[PDB]
Amino acid sequence: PIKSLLVVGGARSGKSRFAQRMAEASGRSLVLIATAQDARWTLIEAFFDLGQTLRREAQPERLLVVDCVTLWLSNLLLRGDDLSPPIKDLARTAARLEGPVIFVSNEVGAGIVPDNALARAFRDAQGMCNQRLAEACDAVTLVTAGIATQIKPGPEPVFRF
Amino acid sequence: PIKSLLVVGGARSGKSRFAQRMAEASGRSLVLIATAQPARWTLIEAFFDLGQTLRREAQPERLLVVDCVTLWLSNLLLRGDDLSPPIKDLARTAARLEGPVIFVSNEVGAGIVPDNALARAFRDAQGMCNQRLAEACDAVTLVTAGIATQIKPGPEPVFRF
Amino acid sequence: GSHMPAGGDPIKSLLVVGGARSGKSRFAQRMAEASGRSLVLIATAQDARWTLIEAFFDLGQTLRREAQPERLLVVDCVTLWLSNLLLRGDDLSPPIKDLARTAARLEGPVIFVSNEVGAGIVPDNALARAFRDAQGMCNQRLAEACDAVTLVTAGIATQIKPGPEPVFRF
């Protein structure tokens, strides 16, 4: 079994629904950690203090689903925070949490460079954030048009030149 | 054999070329359903009435390639139409075709969307449409820099927490 | 025993493609540094082991001259090169075709770092649309010419070539 899963994909790719289905199959006590501004599911708000909330609510009998990382970074960005320390803190939290967690996050770097400095800083922070999370998490799935593809665990390619 | 293929990926990723290649190996009579407003291939235009055209023109003697779902959704959005009805109709049709169809569609959710309500609406609509076409079609392929990866059929990843 | 090409079935060419801040640049380094060759950065933007050569526009010319059996060139990166040509008003089709023909016919190994820019909504201007079309087209031709293609997502590399592409029978 795994401690941590990162689910990454485009906007409106069905990643939430995928994270939901993996969580329900765990037959553990299910918490939605909601970041945006049935009865087996407890909803907990975490608009800004995501790491603090995760450390508060995590326990071995619970599975927390963060829905979602991108709207948490949007909250921090608009509040004026430096996104780097909280991203780095979140990666430490994901590596050593006292209960299982699924993180839902968006790919935002696969379009044209934004014509707006905040959009660029956001694109960079979200890209760094997914790299840190993927490295810290036991498993990573890409979700494309509702279909999940595992990309960790799995060996990295090695090429000879 | 399969009845339905979705070819998804970024813009100018070689999706059309891949759909055309799968079509030409089929030995059926080949029809291009062209949604864009300005050999062994018949062209039939369907700027708006795509689900209608598919119910009427699909048949066991033919293979239709829809080129492409993104411009059809765009055509509707800019005409003023509500997008949820045509999308749910397309997905219903896609599950019940008279003969083989390949859907070409764009990923539009892996960037930073323009800050305008029309762009957000388009992104949400295109994303739910690809999820519904992926669910309805027998097979799905992601095309990356001209190279196709099959993601359906295939066993969905499972995890123990 | 059976034929395996000399040097442990090596590659001469690798395309690394991913979004902005996907970790593609640092995967390209890990690969370059396991090669044992003299490592050259071909910088397109206008360390002890790394030589740097700048090629803001003449990327084709520069690869042809500088590639050698004992060198590994890393092109960082295809997207700024293309951006450099677009802003100068150059026809993009000929240099793209010239670059993939160069990649197929190289005297020394080369890694190409390139961006995916085609998976969002393009701003409503003809220059953004032109760049999206050229970069998509350019990644298609490089992918076809290169021995190996890696997609890097959230700093995790997936090999998509070499490998059999799927076929669908109707």
UniProtKB/TrEMBL annotation, chain A:
Any Pfam family matching the protein: CobU
Enzyme Commission numbers on file: 2.7.1.156, 2.7.7.62
InterPro entries the UniProt entry points to: CobU/CobP (IPR003203), P-loop_NTPase (IPR027417)
Residue numbers binding GDP: 12-16, 124
Chain sites annotated for binding GTP: 9-16, 34-36, 45, 67
Residues involved in cob(II)alamin binding: 12, 15, 113, 116, 120
Family recorded in the similarity comment: Belongs to the CobU/CobP family.
Protein name from the UniProt record: Bifunctional adenosylcobalamin biosynthesis protein
Species, as recorded: Methylocapsa palsarum
Organism placement in taxonomy: Bacteria, Pseudomonadati, Pseudomonadota, Alphaproteobacteria, Hyphomicrobiales
